[PDB]
Amino acid sequence: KEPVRFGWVKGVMIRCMLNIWGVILYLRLPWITAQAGIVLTWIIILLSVTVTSITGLSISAISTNGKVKSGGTYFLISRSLGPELGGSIGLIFAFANAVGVAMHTVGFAATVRDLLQEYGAPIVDPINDIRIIGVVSVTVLLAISLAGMEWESKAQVLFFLVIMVSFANYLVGTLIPPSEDKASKGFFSYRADIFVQNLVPDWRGPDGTFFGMFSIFFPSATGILAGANISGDLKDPAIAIPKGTLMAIFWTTISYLAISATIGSCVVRDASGVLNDTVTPGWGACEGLACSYGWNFTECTQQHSCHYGLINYYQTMSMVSGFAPLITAGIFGATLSSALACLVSAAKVFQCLCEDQLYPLIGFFGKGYGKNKEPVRGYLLAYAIAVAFIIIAELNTIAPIISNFFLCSYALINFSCFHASITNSPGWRPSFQYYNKWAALFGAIISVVIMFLLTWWAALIAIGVVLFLLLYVIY
Amino acid sequence: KEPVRFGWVKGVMIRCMLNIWGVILYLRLPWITAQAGIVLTWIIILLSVTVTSITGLSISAISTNGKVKSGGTYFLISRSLGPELGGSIGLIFAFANAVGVAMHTVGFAATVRDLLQEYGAPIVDPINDIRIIGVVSVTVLLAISLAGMEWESKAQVLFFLVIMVSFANYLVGTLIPPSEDKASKGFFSYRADIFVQNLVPDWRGPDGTFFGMFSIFFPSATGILAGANISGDLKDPAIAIPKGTLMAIFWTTISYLAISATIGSCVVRDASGVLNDTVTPGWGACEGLACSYGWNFTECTQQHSCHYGLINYYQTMSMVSGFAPLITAGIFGATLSSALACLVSAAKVFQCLCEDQLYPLIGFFGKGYGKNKEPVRGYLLAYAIAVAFIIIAELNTIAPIISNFFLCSYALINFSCFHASITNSPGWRPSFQYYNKWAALFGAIISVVIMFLLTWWAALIAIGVVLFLLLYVIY
Ligand SMILES: CN1[C@@H](CSCC(F)(F)F)Nc2cc(Cl)c(S(N)(=O)=O)cc2S1(=O)=O
Ligand SMILES: CN1[C@@H](CSCC(F)(F)F)Nc2cc(Cl)c(S(N)(=O)=O)cc2S1(=O)=O
Ligand code: NA
Ligand code: NA
């Protein structure tokens, strides 16, 4: 029986777009669009998708150089800078993936717990919900993954249709004239005054600065390596990976631009929330843009003490939409698909590191054969780390370290491309047309600069871990 | 004719103590002792002189391994981690020395300009005073250095006696009962109440925190390599360098502890300055410690608006002293001696890098023979950089970069000692008794941690410069 192989749409493009898409799309992008305005948010997005376009070009060059197995992303790092950065970066990559599984299952569990506690169902413990639900969910994802690749592919296609149905729901909701409830919370239909009033920044709070918004958005634009991790299950990786990866980046960026632009021209940044604030005839004068529409939000602006509008309410996108539960369905499909992509990615890197003869550090892990064409001893190792970090259940302080474990790989992939091309290395002869040494060098430099600019002590911890592994292997 | 050779007192100990001693001894240590109290200042000092004791032990181990020439400090880095970190760290070291010459000549020129502008107006303009005086002074130092080693040694001994005369002046001044003028500014003789009241911190201002005081004091404790840079002009380096370097560190630390402890038990932290604040009979009550001595400084504490006392006035040490001009003479001898040590150090590293066959980057600099047993083409290269940075004349923003250029050398010296000892390197067999691998490893780690903890972007710039040199040499 032949194995199962996938095309460039269902194998590379869908997976990459599903891993890039998360919950910043639903719960933070409308707030970033309010703090920083439309134009400066577009600058944020287009600056973030340059570091990932350059790395996508390096990946597309690596893919058109020969046949690699699934999870051999670090083979170029190994054969260009020695096999002790190969295995060390491989292990760091495959550990960051298995922690991202936990950090997404926790995000799904929190949404389910919040949805549950409103409907009734007296829960057990207000924080053991996020543990029981997380463990059950990660076990169901493990079963799906361990039942084969076809079932994982079908689950991913299901998630893709759910996300698109949420998008169409939102886009239909924005074209429907406001009702009393939505106009009382800020949503007015497409208006020209709101587009102009909302192009320029309005920073508020202790975190509202351009660096803060870059810190919120940038880590949620990466994920472009989900289709290159399974480069051994595709029908022709040398054509499937460049096209799929680059169109994934392109269409994800178009969605990010369209959502911010259309949300920024419909909802004002301050609104009261109660229907008893329509304009009174004879009430002297009122200050504010919405006064021309029949609503009076002066008390908010005077006191800074209300909870609705584009800048104060994190769930504006659910309010604008025609029917609200489809946005929650979109959130489910956005978190579970990223968790599934990370679980499949961390398994095929562990399974390659366990079979790597030149990096024998963890080659001892396998006892049973598991000869069913599945990385069983790489699925169980990722499941253990995911469950261990789901038990802890509060991961907002471990996040910078894990997020720098991923930029340590971007920097070394780009620098290995540059180093092998300038040195005329014996066997590195890519054929991708749009690849250049100096773009790769720029990507390698800018990834380290961003690593330290985000949080310097987390970068020091990441580099210390990589160095400890590298030096424990040399000695 | 034989060359001139020096003993361990006039060759290693005096030079190291004169390079460690600067102006923090005179103008900032009494202020650090006031912000942080006596005990926490002692902790500052003893934490700073651990990173330098460990590096002194590594240096003393390198020195008892064989005969090195003058300026071959980076030879162990070259033969343990390859000759492209050897030359790169050597060049960075010898450039930081030549910029330290400028940063000390500017400090001397500022003192001379301030002393001049008070006595009359024989000044061009502070702006260009600090340039004309700086250039003339650095040229006089260049002449002294270029006239031989004996004259430089005599100048250093002169500076040492001037500093000791300043110390004895201050110590005699603190034992003399206060007069009206000194008591009106805060100086009371050795009192027991003041010792107790002034042991615990009192942080004020936007910079008054333990990290801030570490940042002020730590860079002014290094300079321990001034006697190992001329290890080719000593009578027996293998005995002279360990003993001289370690006793230099010991006696400098004893002076740092004694000055802070004795200044902290004589002067209160707030005092008005005018003689019209003695205690009035019938003036109700007064708040403050000095009220028991006959002085009334309540208005300061109420308004925070006076300019004298240990915490507000930077020149307390000149006020306490019996005769004040000897403190200014001590400041001259402290800045000019450090500038002279840095000028001799940067010349003998440039001259070794110009004659280094395995690092040919700047081996082209020499045209004339200059066969007079002096590094003429290393003196002129250091003179050029010193003059170039004295013309700029405002160097408070370049300081962190230059100060991290010096911790990049500490880290690599310590790590090269550890790496050569664990690897059983063929030819690294030191005989210094008090040397251990793990102390060197700790020093190498803590130097990088301190590099980034002081200022992270300056550390990134320093590491980027080192990497650019290292990679330009490989390609
Ligand atoms: C959304 N993710 C961010 C990390 S932000 C959350 C944090 F982990 F930082 F806490 N970066 C990447 C990068 C890659 Cl390359 C891959 S993947 N599957 O290609 O290997 C997956 C991810 S992610 O899904 O974890
Ligand atoms: C007081 N100095 C501080 C630097 S603080 C001022 C700054 F440069 F940072 F701006 N560190 C060192 C270290 C060494 Cl090792 C040597 S030396 N002569 O042994 O090579 C000289 C010096 S220093 O005299 O420049
Ligand atoms: Na997703
Ligand atoms: Na000095």
mmCIF file of C-alpha atoms in Angstrom, chain B residues 46 70 124 135 224 277 284 304 361 376 383 395 405:
data_model
loop_
_atom_site.group_PDB
_atom_site.id
_atom_site.type_symbol
_atom_site.label_atom_id
_atom_site.label_comp_id
_atom_site.label_asym_id
_atom_site.label_seq_id
_atom_site.Cartn_x
_atom_site.Cartn_y
_atom_site.Cartn_z
ATOM 1 C CA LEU B 46 32.367 43.991 47.421
ATOM 2 C CA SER B 70 53.961 43.385 25.775
ATOM 3 C CA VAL B 124 38.013 81.073 25.303
ATOM 4 C CA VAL B 135 44.453 68.707 22.783
ATOM 5 C CA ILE B 224 43.232 45.863 36.562
ATOM 6 C CA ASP B 277 20.810 78.980 61.095
ATOM 7 C CA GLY B 284 9.717 76.493 69.788
ATOM 8 C CA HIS B 304 13.726 70.168 49.517
ATOM 9 C CA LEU B 361 44.039 43.014 8.862
ATOM 10 C CA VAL B 376 56.003 54.781 17.310
ATOM 11 C CA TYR B 383 47.068 59.660 19.379
ATOM 12 C CA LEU B 395 31.203 61.685 25.180
ATOM 13 C CA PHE B 405 33.993 46.859 24.706
#
